[PDB]
Write a protein that binds this ligand. Sequence first.
Ligand SMILES: CS(=O)(=O)N1CCc2c(c(-c3ccc(Cl)c(CCc4ccc(Cl)c(CNCc5ccccc5)c4)c3)nn2CCCN2CCOCC2)C1
Length: 219
Amino acid sequence: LPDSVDWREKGCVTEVKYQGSCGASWAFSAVGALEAQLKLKTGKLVSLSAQNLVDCSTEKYGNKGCNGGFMTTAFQYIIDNKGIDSDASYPYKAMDQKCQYDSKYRAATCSKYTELPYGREDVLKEAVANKGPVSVGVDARHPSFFLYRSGVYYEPSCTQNVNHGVLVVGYGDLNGKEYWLVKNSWGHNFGEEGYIRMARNKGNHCGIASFPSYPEILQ
Ligand SMILES: CS(=O)(=O)N1CCc2c(c(-c3ccc(Cl)c(CCc4ccc(Cl)c(CNCc5ccccc5)c4)c3)nn2CCCN2CCOCC2)C1
């Protein structure tokens, strides 16, 4: 219902991360959403361990660490494992390590996650306004993505087949041109201090609505 949202206004979005040479965007997209539920439920913002996901959410979850994975099964790992460690206690090293999860430093839980209908930007808007930041994949394979600096991103070559996990933390328009507020994991020097505004309501542009999902911390 709100014509614009931005979850950084309510202190639900941590600092932008730098995934480096490790292909772990699924891990960063996942913790990003669970961080936002953790501030909602408890009132505390704290970065969750991407390294935990990479090191421990593996073959049983269909993931391959720095060579790809999925945000959905990363949520299933957190459910199964009954927790996830803080970034502070389990820092990211942009490489594949042995699982070193320590329940002592558990910072967040997961009760469930929810996948959204393919391509439904109306339904995606609802979840971002009513439930919190939503994990999505995008097609980020195109040179314009890499060269993105600011403004509303539109790429007529863009397809609906996604290949890069990111986090939708809000939405709006730029003098009418509508967009999704996307947090990426390429450090603050990428985009708009780490963010990219990608075209919204342009037929699932770059497949931002192809496979959305978001976790929940239930009471
Ligand atoms: C053809 S489809 O695309 O429509 N779709 C097919 C179906 C699908 C996709 C995703 C997805 C959602 C989010 C993301 Cl994040 C991704 C990433 C997939 C991916 C594909 C290709 C490459 Cl190279 C890379 C690696 N990234 C390289 C890269 C880096 C930087 C810029 C650009 C590229 C990643 C896929 N879920 N699902 C549904 C469930 C699939 N399974 C779930 C668990 O197991 C069982 C089945 C992709």
